[PDB]
Amino acid sequence: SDEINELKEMVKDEHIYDKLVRSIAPAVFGHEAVKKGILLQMLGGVHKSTVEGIKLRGDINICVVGDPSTSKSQFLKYVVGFAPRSVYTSGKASSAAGLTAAVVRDEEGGDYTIEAGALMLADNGICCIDEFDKMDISDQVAIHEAMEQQTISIAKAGIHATLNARTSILAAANPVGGRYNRKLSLRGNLNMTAPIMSRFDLFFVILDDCNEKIDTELASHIVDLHMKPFSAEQLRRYIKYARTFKP
């Protein structure tokens, strides 16, 4: 009864949505759009199977691009520190086999056996990738099937199975010239091609400006950090209830 009441307070209040928006990664000041985006990604849509048997993906992908100054990595760190299941990785450190699945010779026999990559791990969870634009295209391609079909297909060395890849991809990246070339439009500042951009349900490009009123508060809070509604523990309890609904 007390557990139900505690979980009920977080659901039956009028302003709960804004309260949860203003609670993701409280250390990062501003950037409310990404706070909404991550909150929605953590509560991915209901998966549906057609009466024809065709499946509909329910997980949400997010990509964020920012200047080298805007704190884009702290969101990834907060997600991997908060998500029940999460994996953090770097764009250049990762490789094709290390993300999806590894074909390796097994013990107790001469046949092969899979090993879980970054995507198979934290299945039914959020996978975080930093420096996404730095990734080689040849190993960005392999993420596509997990991003849209929620599956990993292997046809290598005696393995022909299809594996569950129900993961929400969260990525961070930088513009093509590091700085946001504000002279040009959004089309020319990104090296990502259309196929990969089309697979992100949410997409944010955050910028920096010399507005005095913004920079003063930014300095005040980033200095308070070095000087020192709903708690982070409560959000997992709320999500464990919310995730089961099927609108």
Binding site: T89, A93, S94, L121, E131, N174, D208, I222, V223, M227
Partner: protein, 626 residues
């Protein structure tokens, strides 16, 4: 024979245990600690083995004991049990005795005097008490070691308890029952036996090479990867591999030195003296000296590290390699590397699984090896792109995350990086923007703390100064005190930023902002350098003067005052009409003020404070008899 006389040794240790004091220092040590140990439920006492050297008979005991530690430890177990029993019931001070009476105790001396070194140990030095130091790298999983054997008779189910003495298993020949006399009917049940934890830990040892230690009982998993470790135990080689049976493990100056430190800190030329004494072969360069010394001091670490990183972007003939090579030797030991002669694996690590260990192991690279220290990277402009990508997460979170085939792990690389980079082309060219003179991309260049443009200008006067500084040096504070001061400041002072010091950060950052490359990264430096300055002053808080000096240092390093705000170019020269106008207006104002007050004259300090909130103007007025 045995150097340990049981009654003589126990009486000697009884006398020591009741009479020791260090020389409030006058209070007795173990006379106080005995009650605390009787209070404690712990199963062991860490004997302060430095007391063995502080007292004469205990030094003699050490010299006798160097060959027989086990006997004295075994005696001390019973001695501890008897002392507990006496202090509990014989002294009638306590009544909880049963579990202490039944259990077994141990004692671990943790500050024994060191030996002559690992490689100097002789074949007869085996089985002797030794003391060593180093760094731990790897750990083996928990391995059970047999203590009790549980034998059951396979024809009548009778059970016997058999224990191991000196590594020997003795299978019972016949069943002990009067009726059942069947020979060889005893069998061992594997999972009813009793075992104890044994673990092998790898340690990179530095004598006063790597040694694989062995630990037993509660010592397992107390040492883990990366631990800073001092070892007190037994050197072993048995029929012959070299290994250490650990008896205890440690997870880690005079008042005249304090007086010297205070004297050097109090004198007004402290910064000047430090810069002058750090590097005699490098002339002047006050800002560079202050910056590198501040990097050695480092900022405050809170949980937000203070690892200051500096880049030298001077002309490719200025003494910069001579500074980094010297820093590699004067600072507490780190690793000297070059960007050209390094790779991504070379910096971070090589990581692979192990069949024996059944967990990931690391071959530490230089960047991770520098954990907690300083690393030097020459040819920073020549580092490969894949290697440069590692620096990003290193400088942003002091971590390195790797996700490859079968391996997914993160490694810590908390270290300060000092780097030098030649400008694009054969020389720095001020005809191009300052950003375009450096071959580092904006994301990597914008996150450094200090970048120094140490240019060389051809001028006969300065050339003569430098030549006469250098040529007379090779004719015909000490480094010890410098290292002592550096260690002391990091050891003690933890400065906290004051309100007034905090306030100036806002204005300084806004002023740097409105001239727009003034990203938020430099605001990290605006506290990192301030804390290091406060530490260097040894002041327990960060002063507003410290903040202003740090801001000035950043400005001079970047050289904004000589930098063109329109194109980023640099003036070559860094009497003017604006100077004339300012001097004329100042002279008029001071001429009005000096007579507006109800006095014919006033002190120049008060006039300066009244006007500035000058000397040349008043001197010229005096020349005109005004």
């Amino acid at each position: 024979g045995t150097n340990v006389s049981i009654q003589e040794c126990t009486t000697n240790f009884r006398n020591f245990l009741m009479s020791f004091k260090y020389k409030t220092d006058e209070e007795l040590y173990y006379i106080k600690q005995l009650n605390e140990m009787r209070e404690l439920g712990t199963s062991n006492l860490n004997l302060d083995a430095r007391n063995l050297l502080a007292y004469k008979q205990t030094e003699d005991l050490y010299h006798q004991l160097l060959n027989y530690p086990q006997e004295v430890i075994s005696i001390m177990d019973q001695t501890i049990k008897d002392c507990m029993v006496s202090l509990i019931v014989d002294n009638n001070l306590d009544y909880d005795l049963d579990e202490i009476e039944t259990k077994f105790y141990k004692v671990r001396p943790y500050n024994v005097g060191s030996c002559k070194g690992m490689r100097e140990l002789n074949p007869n030095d085996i089985d002797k008490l030794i003391n060593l130091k180093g760094l731990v790298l790897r750990s083996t999983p928990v391995i059970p070691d047999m203590k009790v054997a549980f034998f059951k008779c396979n024809v009548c189910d009778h059970t016997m308890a058999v224990e191991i003495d000196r590594g020997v298993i003795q299978e019972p020949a016949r069943c002990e029952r009067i009726d059942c006399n069947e020979p060889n009917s005893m069998s061992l049940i594997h999972n009813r036996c009793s075992f104890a934890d044994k673990q092998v830990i790898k340690l990179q040892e530095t004598p006063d090479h790597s040694i694989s230690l062995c630990v037993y009982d509660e010592l397992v998993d107390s040492c883990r990867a990366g631990d800073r470790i001092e070892v007190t135990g037994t050197f072993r080689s048995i029929p012959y591999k070299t290994y250490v049976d650990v008896v205890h493990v440690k997870k880690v100056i005079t008042d005249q030195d304090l007086a010297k430190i205070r004297e050097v800190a109090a004198r007004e030329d402290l910064y000047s003296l430090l810069a002058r004494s750090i590097a005699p072969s490098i002339y002047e360069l006050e800002d560079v000296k202050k910056g590198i010394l501040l990097q050695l001091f480092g900022g405050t670490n809170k949980t937000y590290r203070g690892d200051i990183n500096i880049l030298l972007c001077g002309d490719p003939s200025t003494s910069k390699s001579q500074i980094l090579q010297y820093v590699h030797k004067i600072t507490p030991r780190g690793v000297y590397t070059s960007g050209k002669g390094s790779s991504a694996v070379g910096l971070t690590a090589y990581i692979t699984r192990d069949v024996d260990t059944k967990q990931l192991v690391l071959e530490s690279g230089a960047l991770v090896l520098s954990d907690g220290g300083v690393c030097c990277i020459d040819e920073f402009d020549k580092m490969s792109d894949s290697t440069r990508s590692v620096l990003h997460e290193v400088m942003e979170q002091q971590t390195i995350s790797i996700a490859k085939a079968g391996i997914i792990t993160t490694l810590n690389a908390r270290s300060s990086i000092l780097a030098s980079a030649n400008p694009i082309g054969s020389r720095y060219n001020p005809n191009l923007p300052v950003t375009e003179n450096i071959d580092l991309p904006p994301p990597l260049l914008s996150r450094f703390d200090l970048v120094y443009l140490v240019l060389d200008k051809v001028d006969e006067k300065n050339d003569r100064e430098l030549a006469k500084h250098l040529t007379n040096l090779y004719l015909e504070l000490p480094v010890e005190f410098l290292t002592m001061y550096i260690s002391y400041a990091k050891e003690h002072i933890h400065p906290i930023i004051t309100e007034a010091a905090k306030t100036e950060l806002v204005r300084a950052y806004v002023g740097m902002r409105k001239m727009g490359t003034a990203t938020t990264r430099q605001l990290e430096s605006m506290i990192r350098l301030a804390e290091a300055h406060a530490k260097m002053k040894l002041k327990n808080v960060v002063e507003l003067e410290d903040v202003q000096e740090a801001v000035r240092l950043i400005r001079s390093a970047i050289k904004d005052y000589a930098t063109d705000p329109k194109t980023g170019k640099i003036d070559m020269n860094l009497k003017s009409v604006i100077q004339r106008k300012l001097q004329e207006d100042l002279s008029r104002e001071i001429m009005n003020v000096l007579k507006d007050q109800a006095s014919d004259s006033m002190s120049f300090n008060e006039l300066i404070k009244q006007i500035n909130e000058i000397q040349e103007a008043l001197s010229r007025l005096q020349q005109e008899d005004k």
